[PDB]
DNA sequence: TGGAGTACAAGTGTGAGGAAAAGTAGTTGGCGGAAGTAAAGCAGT
DNA sequence: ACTGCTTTCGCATGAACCTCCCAACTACTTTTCCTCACACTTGTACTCCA
């Protein structure tokens, strides 16, 4: 009766903080946290060698807007969110391609387990 | 734009308009601050 | 009135009133919750518990024309088809349609079998439809003079 | 076409308070009607309508032009103005057609 | 003769105001007991 | 004991609904447009007042 899913995310109702009612293991699980290397982007502050390791490179506005704020270890956890925000940008805007062999032709360097998940 | 606001209503955010305090430092004019919404949340639920 | 007051090559006026009460005669409940713009009821809408003003004007204008053209059975069958079970004004004109029949049928131009017991229906219809007009809400008729018009129709009968 | 572009094409309200003059000023500012075209208002064909408009004697056609010729830049050439400048509507009565009426 | 200044008129910075077609919402109406003849094991005193 | 109550039976074959969600009729927001007035400041004119 429950398979055919809900639109509501996996929340935390008994939590009192808004960053606590959205748990970090809901959107991205605790196994996929260590399949991403974190020093490939923060060590090189560059205009091309930071945009090179993004899943969906584009000439847009919001993509390179929140990236150029700071190089601080506080946003180290939220650095993989932007890496996973841009990977979800490729899925929703494509409705005619129904395979993975043509998914490379719109992207450049997609992730390994984050794409198949 | 209203196709986007309807997605947040399942979450439960009270998507309301901006203020004149939230008008000067955001690049939008002070008179046309009605079509420009700001979505916050409430901490118990 | 520009059609009725014209009378040169008029559409008789009454046909336009029939047009209004064909497509604007609604039976919707008046919802009263929505703020109303551009329609305001007492002369242009036709909801339940308010017979529209063009509806009752179609009744009186097609009764005065019905008298000036001396078809009375057409309107008396036409008014027969809606029971407006709320108001009193359409009952009075449905009373008054028979009272005009009892006026015209009671001439008899003698100087006598079916023409007597025909009129005694129409005398009975007026005494009931005026009674059911009084059963409904406020529509103050002269219910004394109209009885005194039926008695004069029986003095023509005797 | 969108709901705003199909509402800008039907001209719901006619040009008022010199709205039509200020659009020529924008038009003479984006493209240079000056320095390419003869921005010379045929002011002789203007006043002949204004003579026959209110049935005045034709002496006033040449009573007017000597007033125009006395108070003018280089005698002739009521030149049509251009505004490439800004969203500021020149209150100088810079419009050449507007100047002939005041004369 | 001189300078004060106060006006007048010019020039630059900045968002608020009037408009319409689509859409939304907002609320109702409205639809899909006069049947026989016969057996049986089960009850009653 | 004969009680009651069962119960099985039967002329061929042919034909013999309830919420609910969509509809009409209104209004009120929506999603971008073009069109200027206003607030100052430098400037040029004014007539001084000893």
Task: Walk me through the structure.
This is part of a larger assembly, with 2 copies of chain A, 1 copy of chain C (158 residues) and 1 copy of chain D (103 residues). Chain A has 117 residues and is an all-alpha fold. In chain A, 28% of the residues lie in helices and 0% in strands. Chain A contains 5 helices and no strands. The longest helix of chain A has 17 residues, at 76-92. Chain A is globular. Chain C is mainly α and 158 residues long. Helices cover 55% and strands 0% of the residues of chain C. With 103 residues, chain D is mostly helical. Chain D is built from 5 helices and no strands. Chain D is globular. Chains in contact: A-B. The interface between A and B is small, with 7 and 6 residues. Chain D binds a DNA duplex (45 and 50 nucleotides) through residues 2-8, 10, 12-13, 17, 19, 22-23, 86-89, 92.
By DSSP (H or I, 4+ residues per run), the number of helices of chain D equals 5
Give, in order, the helices and strands of chain A.
Answer: HHHHH
Instruction: Quote the distance from N terminus to C terminus of chain A.
Output: 24 Å
Q: Approximately how much helix is present in the residues of chain A?
A: 25-40%
Q: Output the helix-strand order of chain D.
A: HHHHH
Strand content of chain A: under 5%
Shape type of chain D: globular
Biggest interface, chains and residues, is:
A-B, 7 and 6 residues
- Number of E strands of chain A: 0
Terminal residue distance of chain D: 46 Å
Oligomer: part of a larger assembly
| Contiguous helical run count of chain A | 5
